[PDB]
């Protein structure tokens, strides 16, 4: 999470608020999102209102906006994380390099996890990373 995004979201929510106790109307959600550049469809706006009473509160608004932001951020991060390796531009990962980089910092547990990756990865050995994404993210 970045700081001025939080500042802008707070300022927009309070800008379209009047009394100041976390109480705006439900229909002004579309207005405050299109002031923030967000424009989903009508049923998605309704589903996000039903995710929230009549008065939209502040932190869950931040949480849903965090979901919508970290979606595209997660795509660009899984882009840049494997643009660290694999300089050619095909997104293809050799399995010996999988044995190398799978024991990375953060988790770095034993041979169980790297055998768990190697038993099912599809190996032509250059492996496309989207199979790894579909594997790990259930």
């Amino acid at each position: 999470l970045t700081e001025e995004q939080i500042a802008e979201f707070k300022e927009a929510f309070s800008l379209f608020d009047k009394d100041g106790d976390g109480t705006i109307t439900t229909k002004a959600l579309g207005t405050v999102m299109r002031s923030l550049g967000q424009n989903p469809t009508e049923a998605e706006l309704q589903d996000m209102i039903n995710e929230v009473n009549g008065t939209i509160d502040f932190p869950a608004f931040l949480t849903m906006m965090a979901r919508k932001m970290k979606d595209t951020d997660s795509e660009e991060e899984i882009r840049e994380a494997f643009r660290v390796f694999d300089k050619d531009g095909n997104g293809y990962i050799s399995a010996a390099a999988l044995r190398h980089v799978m024991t990375n910092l953060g988790e770095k547990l034993t041979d169980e996890e790297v055998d768990e990756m190697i038993r099912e990865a599809d190996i032509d050995g250059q492996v496309n990373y989207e199979a790894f994404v579909q594997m790990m993210t259930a």
């Binding site: 469809t41 049923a43 998605e44 309704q46 589903d47």
Partner: protein
């Protein structure tokens, strides 16, 4: 919610995937009933699911095959417009290949019921058919044994409706004459002819001399007429029920579904009402009249339409050209008057779109010509004319960055299709080869050495 609607869609696809293909065809009935408005993306998703079901009902599943022929005609007709429609059209080539592996708020539509009159040759006929219908209805009541008396009470088996043809007044008959006569006025409306032929033939109350009206059966188009009038009876009764339940101010009743998603008893009653006329006509001798292979039959018609479209397709109907390439590949998966006509139309379309050789057509023409060359043996001495046509095509593709190799591989596919089992075109290809030799070249050299046989 679009997420919740897509969740329901995935649930329905999983319910329809692993469930034999009998109920799958029963659902594909309603799927084809709603699919004709594909020209609304959810109908295209349901059509992709039905194409997967046809891929599940091709060999053993693919009666309803005539309904499959009408459904394939509707899929040819509604998708004759020229995205998600590209996905449904990619499903539609699998639908056509599976149909060749087979060949290996709804609102009812009423017609007017009392505006077309009755001929008198049936007015000397209803005057005894009403007595015979009272015979059969009285036999149906005496199956219980309703004995007429003075007190009309249904405890000791007494109806006030077991009375003969003579005691009935001028309005007691018309109560039960009314739906039968106002269905005769519908059957006599559309232009149907029942003309002169040969003639023919306990308990208390009314004991009839009734002919057994239970075991008389017509033929195919005659029962098609009877089924259309049963759908007319059901649509009038559904209009009656839907203008009966819209007179209060509430909701409805949940049987208001498409016509191919219903039960049989409500249609069996309408079947008996439609066909007690027809059984009595076949007993007395009065006849009833009007008054697969169709895919390969219309494949020459579709091929001629595709050539006439591909003559001047330089505008968004190149998706139709990709659909025609996919339909030809599906016919290759499902393969000679119409076949020779399709090969000649493939040559004519390869010559007609040779001068402009849209965007996906520029890559799809190679796939279409290769599929036709491979299917040319899976299906005739004037081929020097289309050979000179392809010679001019390669002359228009030589100087107009891998198009020369595409022309060389197309000549390879042409010579391989001619050699799968007049020498003007050889002179033209050698002329272009010697013209473009000093200035896609090595592939042409190894393609001429591969199409040399």
């Amino acid at each position: 919610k679009g997420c919740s609607l897509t969740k329901a869609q995935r649930d329905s696809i999983e319910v329809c995937l692993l469930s034999r293909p009998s109920m799958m065809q029963h659902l594909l009935r309603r799927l084809v009933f709603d699919v004709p408005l594909l020209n609304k993306m959810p109908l295209k998703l349901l059509t992709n699911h039905y194409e997967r079901c046809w891929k599940y009902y091709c060999l053993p599943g693919g009666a309803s095959e005539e309904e499959l022929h009408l459904s394939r005609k509707l899929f040819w007709g509604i998708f004759d417009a020229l995205y998600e429609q590209e996905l449904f059209k990619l499903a539609l080539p699998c639908l056509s290949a599976v149909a060749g592996a087979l060949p290996p708020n709804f609102n009812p539509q009423p017609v007017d019921t009392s505006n077309i009159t009755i001929p008198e040759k049936l007015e000397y006929f209803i005057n005894k058919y009403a007595e015979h219908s009272h015979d059969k209805w009285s036999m149906d009541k005496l199956a219980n044994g309703w004995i007429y008396g003075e007190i009309y009470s249904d405890s000791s088996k007494v109806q006030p409706l077991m009375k003969p043809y003579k005691l009935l007044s001028e309005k007691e008959k018309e109560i039960y004459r009314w739906p039968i006569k106002e269905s005769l006025k519908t059957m006599l409306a559309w232009g149907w002819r029942i003309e002169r032929t040969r003639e023919g033939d306990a308990a208390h109350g009314y004991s009839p001399r009734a002919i057994d009206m239970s075991n008389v059966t017509l033929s195919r188009d005659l029962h098609a007429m009877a089924e259309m009038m049963a759908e007319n009876y059901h649509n009038i009764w559904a209009k009656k029920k839907k203008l009966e339940l819209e007179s209060k101010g509430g909701g409805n009743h949940p049987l208001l579904v498409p016509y191919d998603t219903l039960t049989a008893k409500e249609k069996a009653k309408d079947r008996e009402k439609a066909q007690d006329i027809l059984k009595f006509l076949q007993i007395n001798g009065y006849a009833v009249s009007r008054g697969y292979f169709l895919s390969a039959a219309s494949r020459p018609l579709c091929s001629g339409g595709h050539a006439s479209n591909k003559e001047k397709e330089m505008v968004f109907c190149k998706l139709g050209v990709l659909v025609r390439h996919r339909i030809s590949l599906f016919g290759n998966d499902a393969t000679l008057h119409i076949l020779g006509q399709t090969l000649d139309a493939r040559t004519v379309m390869k010559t007609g779109l040779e001068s402009v050789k849209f965007l996906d057509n520029a890559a799809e023409d190679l796939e279409k010509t290769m599929e036709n060359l491979k299917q040319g043996q899976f299906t005739t001495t004037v081929a020097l004319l289309p050979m000179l046509s392809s010679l001019f095509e390669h002359i228009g593709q030589h100087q107009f960055l891998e198009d020369v190799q595409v022309s060389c591989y197309r000549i390879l596919t042409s010579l391989y299709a001619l050699g799968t089992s007049v020498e003007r075109q050889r002179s033209a290809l050698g002329e272009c080869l010697a013209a473009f030799a000093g200035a896609a070249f090595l592939e042409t050299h190894l393609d001429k050495h591969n199409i040399y046989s």
